[PDB]
């Protein structure tokens, strides 16, 4: 139908905007701490601690399959990256501190993304 196509064009445009948001968030991780999944070869107990692991490559795969229907879903995955790290790693670690900085800096980007998504519909 024509409606399905219009819906698909909106999803494609949301995907465009989320790709730009993802790129901007990932620039706030210059150490690439959150770039890839935590390795189960190197942290064999990880899934005993963290039930829903997340990282920027896994988000990018979902994104390019147009798997985020709305900004809320995308933010849920970003929040998992941060929140998983702040539980697994202690406060005094480069990892925890990297998450805090990513959270704080990403807040600004996500604030304007919400306005853009609402604004453009």
Curated annotation (Swiss-Prot):
Naturally occurring in which organism (per UniProt): Homo sapiens
Cross-link (Glycyl lysine isopeptide (Lys-Gly) (interchain with G-Cter in SUMO2)): 41
Function, in words: Scaffold subunit of various histone acetyltransferase (HAT) complexes, such as the MOZ/MORF and HBO1 complexes, that acts as a regulator of hematopoiesis. Plays a key role in HBO1 complex by directing KAT7/HBO1 specificity towards histone H3 'Lys-14' acetylation (H3K14ac), thereby promoting erythroid differentiation.
Protein name: Bromodomain-containing protein 1
Assembly behavior: Component of some HBO1 complex composed of KAT7/HBO1, MEAF6, ING4 and BRD1/BRPF2. Component of the MOZ/MORF complex composed at least of ING5, KAT6A, KAT6B, MEAF6 and one of BRPF1, BRD1/BRPF2 and BRPF3. Interacts (via PHD-type zinc finger domain) with unmodified histone H3. Interacts (via PWWP domain) with dimethylated and trimethylated 'Lys-79' on histone H3.
Portion held of the full protein: 555 to 674 of 1058
Domain Bromo: 9-113
Tissue expression: Highly expressed in testis.
Compartments reported by the entry: Nucleus; Chromosome
Coiled-coil annotated residue ranges, if any: none
């Amino acid at each position: 139908s024509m409606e399905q196509v219009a819906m698909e064009l909106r999803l494609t445009e949301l995907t465009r905007l989320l790709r730009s948001v993802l790129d901007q968030l990932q620039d706030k991780d210059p150490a690439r701490i959150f770039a890839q999944p935590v390795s189960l070869k190197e942290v064999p107990d990880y899934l005993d601690h963290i039930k829903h692991p997340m990282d920027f490559a896994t988000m990018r795969k979902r994104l390019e399959a147009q798997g985020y229907k709305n900004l809320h879903e995308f933010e849920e995955d970003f929040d998992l990256i941060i929140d998983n790290c702040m539980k697994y790693n202690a406060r005094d670690t480069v990892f925890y501190r990297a998450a805090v900085r990513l959270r704080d800096q990403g807040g600004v980007v996500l604030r304007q993304a919400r306005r853009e998504v609402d604004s453009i519909g």
